[PDB]
Design a protein around this nucleic acid. Structure first.
Ligand SMILES: [Mg+2]
Length: 577
DNA sequence: GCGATCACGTT
DNA sequence: GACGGACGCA
């Protein structure tokens, strides 16, 4: 029972409403709005967007921060409206973000999935209404309107139960003061986009094409035959049947040709180093050059990423189209791809600031490890210090390989890799990897106690938490399957570290955005990837940003150790180093 | 077009 | 020990 409205009425513009502004295209940048639903104290309404979005009263209502709206994935609507020149304000509850906080492992894709968390089933999944893949389509208006009204009615009914559970979890401020404000900031970042030097990218592609053509010819000569080097199956036949190289590792289907396996084969045949070079050149070309050019909008000459704020179980952001976090960080030629990301206006520059070792600093804080805290209080090189402690040697006795091994132990902590993974990364035995870890724990006994205590807490409570009260449930922590249990244990250890770093970065973004407005700077946030925040600003704002940005980031939270920020500016993202 | 795989960046 | 370009069927 709802009103299919042909005009906007005052009844539709109440102080509080559930609002659905439906964008069916997966990528919502400059995408159609196919329909609108409003549920409030006065009734339930379906509005056609060509009418409502042309109505000055409805547009004023949308932009009025005192008119409160409950939505699901408000950033999607906010950005689609930005492309139409319409501001969305007053979103006081986002059911997507609420469900994400309550349990990020549920994978809540749509209103129906969130509704099922509270035994509400009077709404269909989006996939059931719009179909999948090739058959995907907007249905006729009667079907569309009922769906959008059912989604709005679900939001209207679910706000209270969700807020009640968030309050019980001490997550209500996490939603209202962190994730929801961040959603608006992300919306602005996505809409602003990042300018891309497509001429430079095409230049890079041309250079890669030349080098690829030469290595490919080298491989055919060495193989005595032409084949598709990009086919693992064809390559396996050349390597393991034609050239009779050893089979050191299998796949489920045939022989593995992974880079790990190939490096082990390099001493036996000159073709192997060439295949490795082809693979590295080819992934830069196909994935990062051509992949980037594919998602540059020809109308803006910018990339307009979509952040997924409700995906990871740590609380880190993710992004797509492009995913700029997946650009390799190793200089070689991977990092140079950042040269293609330039300021959007003449006489502007890129300003980039990154937290230095925020994850290990968070660990020092949470574990209250005296040795690790003092190391950061002295602003030591943490990998050199870790090697000094593990090997019981003075700083001048730390060899490069000692530091490399200490760094791998620290990497293992930051990313939650097992002793098998440490052994894999260091190319040592599992017993030797285990012995390394015990030596580490002798030097950092507070870290060891934390690791023991957090696994026990996960077993007792069923979940672990971050500094700002994000939760991750770990039902597998007592699995009788060793691999499943071990993974759960590593996530118990790692999520309070990685997730607290994510919390701090998100708070820094909110604080930064507010400070930039308060200072009346034109500088704007563009991207957040890894532990870095990337802005662009007039060149005349750089000196001010050199003081302001690190200060805001260092002060986002107060820990038992300082937060350290590195910062640079330049004519491209790469040169902001 | 869709599903199953393989590889390689990130986490 | 998830998240995001390159063989058969049908
Ligand atoms: Mg780091």
């Amino acid at each position: 029972a709802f009103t299919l409205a042909d005009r906007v009425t005052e009844e539709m513009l109440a102080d509080k409403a559930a609002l659905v502004v439906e964008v069916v295209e997966e990528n919502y940048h400059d995408a159609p709005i196919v329909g609108i639903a409003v549920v409030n104290e006065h009734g339930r309404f379906f509005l056609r967007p060509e009418t409502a979005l042309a109505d000055p009263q409805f547009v004023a209502w949308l932009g009025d921060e005192t008119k409160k709206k409950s939505m699901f994935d408000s950033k999607r609507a906010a950005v689609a409206l930005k492309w139409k020149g319409i501001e969305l304000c007053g979103v006081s509850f986002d059911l997507l973000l609420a469900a994400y906080l309550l349990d990020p492992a549920q994978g809540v894709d749509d209103v129906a999935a969130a509704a099922k968390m509270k035994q509400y089933e009077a709404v269909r999944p989006d996939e059931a209404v719009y179909g999948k893949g090739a058959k995907r389509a907007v249905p006729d208006e009667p079907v569309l309107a009922e769906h959008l009204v059912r989604k709005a009615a679900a939001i209207w009914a679910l706000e209270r139960p969700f807020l009640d559970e968030l309050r019980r979890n001490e997550q209500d401020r996490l939603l209202v003061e962190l994730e929801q404000p961040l959603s608006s900031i992300l919306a602005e970042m996505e809409f602003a986009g990042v300018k891309v030097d497509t001429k430079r990218l095409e230049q890079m592609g041309e250079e890669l094409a030349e080098q690829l053509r030469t290595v490919e010819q080298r491989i055919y000569e060495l193989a005595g035959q032409e084949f598709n080097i990009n086919s693992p199956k064809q390559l396996g036949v050349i390597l393991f049947e034609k050239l009779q190289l050893p089979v050191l590792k299998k796949t489920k289907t045939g022989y593995s040709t992974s880079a790990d396996v190939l490096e082990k084969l390099a001493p036996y045949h000159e073709i192997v180093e060439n295949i490795l070079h082809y693979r590295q050149l080819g992934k830069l070309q196909s994935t990062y050059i051509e992949g980037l050019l594919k998602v540059v909008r020809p109308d803006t000459k910018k990339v307009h990423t979509i952040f997924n704020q409700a995906l990871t179980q740590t609380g880190r952001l993710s992004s797509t189209e492009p995913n700029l976090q997946n650009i390799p960080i190793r200089l070689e030629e991977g990092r140079k791809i950042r040269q293609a990301f330039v300021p959007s206006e003449s006489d502007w520059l890129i300003f980039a600031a990154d937290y230095s070792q925020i994850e290990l600093r968070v660990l020092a804080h949470i574990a209250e490890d005296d040795n690790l805290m003092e190391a950061f209080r002295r602003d030591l090189d943490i990998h050199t210090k870790t090697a000094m402690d593990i090997f019981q040697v003075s700083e001048d006795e730390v060899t490069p390989n000692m530091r490399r091994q200490a760094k791998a132990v620290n990497f293992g902590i930051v990313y939650g890799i097992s002793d098998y993974g440490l052994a894999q990364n260091l190319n040592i035995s599992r017993k030797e990897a285990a012995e390394f870890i015990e030596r580490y724990f002798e030097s950092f006994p507070g870290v060891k106690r934390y690791m023991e205590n957090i696994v026990q807490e996960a077993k007792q409570k069923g979940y672990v938490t971050t500094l700002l009260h994000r939760r991750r449930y770990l039902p597998d922590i007592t699995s009788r399957n060793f691999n499943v249990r071990s993974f759960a244990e590593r996530m118990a250890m790692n999520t309070p570290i990685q997730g607290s770093a994510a919390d701090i970065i998100k708070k820094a973004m909110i604080d930064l955005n507010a400070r930039l407005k308060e200072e009346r700077l034109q500088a704007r946030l563009l991207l957040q990837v890894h532990d870095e925040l990337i802005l662009e600003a007039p060149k005349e704002e750089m000196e001010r940003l050199c003081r302001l940005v690190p200060e805001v980031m260092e002060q986002a939270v107060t820990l038992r150790v300082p937060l350290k920020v590195d910062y640079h500016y330049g004519s491209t993202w790469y040169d902001a180093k």
